[PDB]
Design a protein around this ligand. Structure first.
Ligand SMILES: COc1ccccc1-c1nnco1
Ligand SMILES: [Cl-]
Length: 115
């Protein structure tokens, strides 16, 4: 079902190196619904190219716009398995510290703060 399940470590590594070559200013982001989630819909896609200058605050707004949420629907975004320490961090900085060994930045969303 999940991205790591669908693609070999070889295939994920090679995709990230191609994005470097073809989208050199973009951060390669996997965004997945929490396997538990009941309230929020699933995204139309899995793999996002995020401009490397937006901070996490702007990425949360983007994703809430992609899910077409409304103001008082709750939405929580884990990065590399854990809560975000701060939303003001530029995604270029977040990438360099939170990226997986395959080169993707992994994110999971829920309506619950308890995942
Ligand atoms: C195979 O090399 C690449 C081609 C494209 C982008 C990155 C790399 C790379 N970086 N570290 C190892 O490979
Ligand atoms: Cl680019």
């Amino acid at each position: 079902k999940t991205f790591k399940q669908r693609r070999t470590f070889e295939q994920r590594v090679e995709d990230v190196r191609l994005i470097r070559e073809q989208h050199p200013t973009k951060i390669p982001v996997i965004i997945e619904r929490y396997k538990g989630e009941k309230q929020l819909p699933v995204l139309d896609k899995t793999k996002f190219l995020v401009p490397d200058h937006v901070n996490m605050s702007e990425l949360i707004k983007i994703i809430r716009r992609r899910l077409q949420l409304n103001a008082n629907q709750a939405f929580f975004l884990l990065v590399n398995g854990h809560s975000m320490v701060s939303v003001s961090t530029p995604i270029s900085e977040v990438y360099e510290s939170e990226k997986d060994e395959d080169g993707f930045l992994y994110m999971v969303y829920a309506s619950q703060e308890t995942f």
